[PDB]
Amino acid sequence: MKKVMFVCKRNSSRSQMAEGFAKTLGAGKIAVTSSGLESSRVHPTAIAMMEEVGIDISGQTSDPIENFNADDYDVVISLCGSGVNLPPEWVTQEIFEDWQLEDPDGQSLEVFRTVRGQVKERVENLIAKIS
Template structure:
């Protein structure tokens, strides 16, 4: 099975939402994980906006990048410039996508919904 890793700064919002979508949409093709270059904890507003559309990410955890998993990944997706810049070097032969998405943390709930919807579109294109 192929492996995919969603990485953002704190593994609290964007990468968590991407993991939630991918675990449902890509489960037949990919083992899915998310991580951050830092650990900020799971953002309750990310949990809330995902729940609004039927995805429960409340059991996910905020994790730092696992280099062993990272080096085994077929696809690495960075979701912000900070993660792209601080991410370990992507091994040769591994695909890397960069999605420059705004960080919704600390912003109104509508921003979380906008980012969520954009992530959903992009994850579905990975099929």
């Protein structure tokens, strides 16, 4: 099945919620591994809001993307540009995606509530085109 990644550089902002929703919406259709570059944990308050929508994002922490090969994957979202200080084989998968997704790091509850809606919609659109 199609394996997905949602990998921006760093993880304190970006590389959160998108993979969590793709796990949710893409369950039984597609696989998701968001390894990361220059990465860290996801935002603390994200996990609480994301668990309020019933989703884990905390559990992302794994090997860096560089440890993997993109040829094993099918789809990769770069989430914060094209170059992203990321190896080129990752963008050149069967679908390249990247969006001006806003991020709730240190922001008010309105931004967490907004980003859940925003991300659900981007991730549904990504799934709807691949699956």
